[PDB]
Amino acid sequence: NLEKELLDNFKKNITQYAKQLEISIEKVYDEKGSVNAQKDIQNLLSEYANMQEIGEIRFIDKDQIIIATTKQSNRSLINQKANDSSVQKALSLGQSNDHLILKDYGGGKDRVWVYNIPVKVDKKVIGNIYIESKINDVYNQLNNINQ
Amino acid sequence: NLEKELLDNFKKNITQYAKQLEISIEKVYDEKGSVAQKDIQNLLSEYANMQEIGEIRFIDKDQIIIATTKQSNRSLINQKANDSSVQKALSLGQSNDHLILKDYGGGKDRVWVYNIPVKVDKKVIGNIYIESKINDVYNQLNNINQ
């Protein structure tokens, strides 16, 4: 059962980090209001994305506009619509969600775990944190030990 | 207590890898020997490729260091471990852990030391000693101000 255990531990880890980012962003809104908070989002995103297991974090507003990213090579996405059904689901339901994707970042299609956590202020959704996490590091290690 | 959760998560990961390595080593004893030894080195090496593991050593029941994953520590092979945590795992037949500070070249870093004994029949034949890079957790905690 080693595979399920390691994947669950990887996901649990990302989710506990992401929750604290969500709480952090919420506190900035509670303290500063929406106009001034929306400028402290980038630093939080970037601090969190330093973790080895996180590929990219985006913050997406209520209207599905990409506000910020931690990936400099994706600066062209800022102010575009996310056009992402999983993001729409989180925004509408106010619930987290997750799924696996294949994505080629330059080395061939890699397995990537996508987690969305909506950001709530006064119980209302204001946006969504979208995370691409490097779950292929788990699969790669399992293959290396023949499990 | 993000901090306790994240530390716990790291340690569970290590402990679940280390349990499978113990099982694998035990298997190779059951069904070969030693002298199993090349197969033991390959197992240690595969396991040490994970990012969060610094070094793995396999120590026999007389406390001799039999194998390491770290090239620069080959001089340790055939020496006594002279390590009280290793002695504890051998004597008690249960895992143990503790934190150390160790300077690998970049200054003293927090390192999590985990020992799991290896048993054949139900008798201790050795011990797996692991140094793990728990300072990756503390570094990230400080980076997010938690």
Numbering used by the authors:
A (entry chain A): 6 to 152
B (entry chain B): 6 to 40, 42 to 152
Paper quotes:
However, the highly anisotropic property of the diffraction data prevented further data processing, which was likely ascribed to the presence of imperfect crystals formed by a mixture of different forms (monomer and dimer) of erWalK6 protein. Further screening of single amino-acid mutants of erWalK6 yielded the construct erWalK6R86M (Arg86 was mutated to Met) that not only exhibited a single peak in size exclusion chromatography analysis (R86M in Supplementary Fig. 1a) but also was crystallized with the crystals diffracting to 1.7 Å resolution. The diffraction data could be processed and the structure was solved by using the seleno-methionine-labelled erWalK6R86M in phase determination. The crystal structure of erWalKR86M revealed that there are two protein molecules in the asymmetric unit that appear to form a tightly packed dimer. The biological relevance of this dimer is unknown; the erWalK686M protein does not form dimer in solution and the dimer is barely found in the wild-type protein when present in high concentrations. Each monomer adopts a canonical PAS domain fold with the presence of five central antiparallel β-strands in a topological order of 2-1-5-4-3. The ends of each monomer are two long helices, directly linking to the transmembrane helices, possibly bridging signal transduction from the extracellular receptor domain to the intracellular kinase domain. The mutation site MSE86 is located in the loop region between the second α-helix and the first β-strand with the side chain of MSE86 facing outwards. Therefore, this mutation is less likely to change the overall structure of the protein, but may contribute to the crystallization. In the ligand-free erWalK conformation, the binding pocket is filled by side chains of E91, R93, V149, Y165 and E167. The salt bridges between E91 and R93, K138 and E167, and the hydrogen bonds between Y165 and E167, Y140 and E167 stabilize the ligand-free conformation.
Among the 16 TCSs in S. aureus, WalKR (YycGF, VicKR and MicAB) is the only essential TCS involved in diverse cellular processes, including cell wall metabolism, virulence regulation, biofilm production, oxidative stress resistance and antibiotic resistance via direct or indirect regulation of autolysins, the saeRS TCS, haemolysins as well as other key virulence factors13. The sensor kinase of this TCS in S. aureus, WalK, possesses three functional domains including the intracellular kinase, the transmembrane helices as well as the extracellular receptor domain, the first two of which have been found to be conserved across the bacteria that contain this TCS. The other functional domain, the extracellular receptor domain (erWalK) is only present in the bacterial species (for example, Bacillus subtilis, S. aureus, Enterococcus faecalis and Listeria monocytogenes) in which this TCS is essential. Here we report the crystal structure of erWalK, revealing a canonical Per-Arnt-Sim (PAS) domain for signal recognition.
